[PDB]
Amino acid sequence: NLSSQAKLWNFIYGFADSLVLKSAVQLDLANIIHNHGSPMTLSELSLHLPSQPVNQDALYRVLRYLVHMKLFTKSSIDGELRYGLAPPAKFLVKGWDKCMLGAILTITDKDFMAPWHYLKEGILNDSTSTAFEKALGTNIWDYMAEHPEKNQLFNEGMANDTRLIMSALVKECSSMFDGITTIVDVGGGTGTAVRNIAKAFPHIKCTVYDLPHVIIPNADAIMMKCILHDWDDKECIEILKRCKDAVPRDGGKVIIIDIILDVKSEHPYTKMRLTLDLDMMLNTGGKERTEEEWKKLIHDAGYKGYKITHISAVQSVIEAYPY
Amino acid sequence: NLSSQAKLWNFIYGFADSLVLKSAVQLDLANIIHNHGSPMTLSELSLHLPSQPVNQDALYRVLRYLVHMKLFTKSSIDGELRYGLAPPAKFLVKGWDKCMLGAILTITDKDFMAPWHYLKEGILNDSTSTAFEKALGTNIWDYMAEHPEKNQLFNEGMANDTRLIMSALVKECSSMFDGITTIVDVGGGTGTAVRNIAKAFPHIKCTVYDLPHVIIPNADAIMMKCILHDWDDKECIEILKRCKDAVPRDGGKVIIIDIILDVKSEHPYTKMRLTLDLDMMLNTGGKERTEEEWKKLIHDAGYKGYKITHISAVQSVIEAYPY
Numbered sequence: 001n002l003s004s005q006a007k008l009w010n011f012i013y014g015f016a017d018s019l020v021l022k023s024a025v026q027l028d029l030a031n032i033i034h035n036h037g038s039p040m041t042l043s044e045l046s047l048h049l050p051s052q053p054v055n056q057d058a059l060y061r062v063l064r065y066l067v068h069m070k071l072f073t074k075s076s077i078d079g080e081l082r083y084g085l086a087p088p089a090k091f092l093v094k095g096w097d098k099c100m101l102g103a104i105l106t107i108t109d110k111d112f113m114a115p116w117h118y119l120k121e122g123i124l125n126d127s128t129s130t131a132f133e134k135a136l137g138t139n140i141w142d143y144m145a146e147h148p149e150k151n152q153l154f155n156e157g158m159a160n161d162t163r164l165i166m167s168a169l170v171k172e173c174s175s176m177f178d179g180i181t182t183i184v185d186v187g188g189g190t191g192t193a194v195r196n197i198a199k200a201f202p203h204i205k206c207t208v209y210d211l212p213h214v215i216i217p218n219a220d221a222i223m224m225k226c227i228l229h230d231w232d233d234k235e236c237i238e239i240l241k242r243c244k245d246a247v248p249r250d251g252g253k254v255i256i257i258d259i260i261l262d263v264k265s266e267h268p269y270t271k272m273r274l275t276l277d278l279d280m281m282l283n284t285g286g287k288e289r290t291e292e293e294w295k296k297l298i299h300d301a302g303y304k305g306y307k308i309t310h311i312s313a314v315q316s317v318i319e320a321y322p323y
Numbered sequence: 324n325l326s327s328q329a330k331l332w333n334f335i336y337g338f339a340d341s342l343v344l345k346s347a348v349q350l351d352l353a354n355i356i357h358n359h360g361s362p363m364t365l366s367e368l369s370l371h372l373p374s375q376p377v378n379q380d381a382l383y384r385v386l387r388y389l390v391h392m393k394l395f396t397k398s399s400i401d402g403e404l405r406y407g408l409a410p411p412a413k414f415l416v417k418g419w420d421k422c423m424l425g426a427i428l429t430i431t432d433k434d435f436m437a438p439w440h441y442l443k444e445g446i447l448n449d450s451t452s453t454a455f456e457k458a459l460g461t462n463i464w465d466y467m468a469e470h471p472e473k474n475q476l477f478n479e480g481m482a483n484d485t486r487l488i489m490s491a492l493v494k495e496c497s498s499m500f501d502g503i504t505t506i507v508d509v510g511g512g513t514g515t516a517v518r519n520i521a522k523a524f525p526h527i528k529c530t531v532y533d534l535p536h537v538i539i540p541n542a543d544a545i546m547m548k549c550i551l552h553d554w555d556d557k558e559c560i561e562i563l564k565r566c567k568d569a570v571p572r573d574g575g576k577v578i579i580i581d582i583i584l585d586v587k588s589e590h591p592y593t594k595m596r597l598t599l600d601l602d603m604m605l606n607t608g609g610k611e612r613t614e615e616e617w618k619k620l621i622h623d624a625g626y627k628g629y630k631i632t633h634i635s636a637v638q639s640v641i642e643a644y645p646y
């Protein structure tokens with residue numbers, strides 16, 4: 001009756017998955033194999049590696065792990081053992097929008113895992129520093145500046161997540177813009193994000209309004225893409241109150257894009273949605289809300305109701321109705 | 324069709340499981356709740372914590388994660404939200420042989436996870452240092468000396484694993500000693516381990532023989548408990564050849580206790596067995612062998628055959644037959 005003990009053992013070693021995968025991305029194993037067009041032997045794979053000579057044995061023991069994770073395949077072809085890609089590894093190949101290689105390099109950076117070791121000090125009072133600041137002795141801004149590459153990759157990461165979010169929005173939720181002729185994108189900075197809407201719906205005038213902050217505009221609809229999960233309840237309701245007055249009684253609305261935590265859910269992203277919240281707490285200081293918490297914010301903002309639409313992304317869409 | 328992408332996302336964040344669990348052990352959440360005898364509210368649990376005041380919100384968000392991991396329970400009792408222990412958390416309670424709290428504190432120590440960030444340099448040649456030495460700038464011996472507590476816990480850990488191994492051995496595999504009247508425990512140091520055999524089978528004379536090493540004896544059977552996974556093939560076969568000559572043609576045998584890697588296995592410990600091998604490679608420099616590799620060692624030692632017995636432990640038992 002030891003499946004119980006095994007769950008826990010596997011939870012203890014959950015980091016081994018992260019870090020084996022990290023090495024596979026670092027060594028770019030999946031691309032190399034796909035770019036090869038045919039499954040590669042140990043020595044063939046070895047010779048494609050950045051530096052030489054390679055420790056075949058270490059490479060073999062890591063492959064065995066990747067293969068057991070079911071990300072890579074091991075197959076006997078002729079008298080040779082050849083390694084291919086199991087289906088999940090398509091996200092380990094370059095040259096398509098869902099490539100996760102950057103995400104991986106970022107998330108599994110030793111320094112970016114570091115703050116997760118201060119979960120206990122997050123809970124016990126010592127302090128006002130973020131777990132990040134406690135583990136690295138600087139704030140992220142500073143950190144990113146002193147690590148411009150990590151920063152560049154990180155920005156490209158965020159830019160790419162916005163394309164994917166925006167794209168699922170216009171494609172999956174286009175009906176949400178029916179009747180709309182103007183939209184204000186709050187926190188849309190440059191306007192790259194809203195531009196997806198202007199492009200898909202040329203009949204809609206898209207305005208960006210960033211909020212002053214320390215280091216309104218009228219429309220049929222207001223949009224907030226991943227804004228609110230940064231603001232606490234006070235700010236969220238105020239902004240949500242400004243938005244009410246900015247959109248028309250007759251049909252106006254606010255479209256919110258953010259994670260909806262639902263722990264009682266069997267959706268595959270449930271776990272990751274939870275993880276993003278602890279990550280929020282460790283780094284930014286925001287949180288991800290449950291539907292009940294969204295309900296209450298909206299209710300406390302004087303709104304009539306809301307409708308949640310699920311999309312092919314971590315985040316969800318909340319159409320919040322002011323009148 | 325995104326279960327594929329979710330596996331990978333969950334693999335990326337596999338470390339979050341390790342580190343949330345780490346905080347739960349650090350805060351000793353499970354014991355406290357069990358010692359309370361009844362499920363506790365946030366504030367009740369908070370007041371039992373080492374230092375004060377506690378960040379209720381951080382504690383709540385970590386609990387939610389633990390509860391989603393199905394280690395803890397969340398239940399509404401009266402008008403209060405109360406947290407209990409899901410079955411896997413029994414291993415998070417003190418006072419029984421299978422308590423895993425020490426294991427957890429050890430394995431999830433930031434410094435002991437550190438070497439897993441050097442998997443890529445394990446593969447690429449720079450160097451002769453262990454991943455451990457590369458991440459901490461010292462060897463373990465030194466390290467342990469400068470961290471006597473971590474060392475004490477670690478030793479107690481190894482001592483406890485030997486009790487459990489030995490105990491499963493005499494209880495599950497007692498028939499393996501039938502007919503045996505003498506046994507030599509190679510690498511049994513003090514003799515604590517073999518003493519389990521002397522105690523269970525008083526009719527057996529138990530000798531310890533440690534091997535000289537830098538910083539034989541005759542018996543019906545020889546025993547090697549977790550010796551061989553440290554020696555490479557050369558040494559393994561030599562030792563296995565000495566053992567042949569030390570035990571009788573008529574029934575003599577060598578009993579090996581060590582992990583048998585079997586990647587094509589649905590046994591719950593398969594993953595962890597793999598993980599222990601990468602851990603070996605990162606720290607000690609040994610490896611864990613597949614049955615085929617054991618077969619070949621034994622075959623190359625001139626043995627007739629072997630029999631594998633599975634026991635309730637990570638390791639397995641190989642009776643290797645010399646004649």
Ligand SMILES: [K+]
Pocket residue numbers: 110113114433436437
């Ligand atoms: K780490």
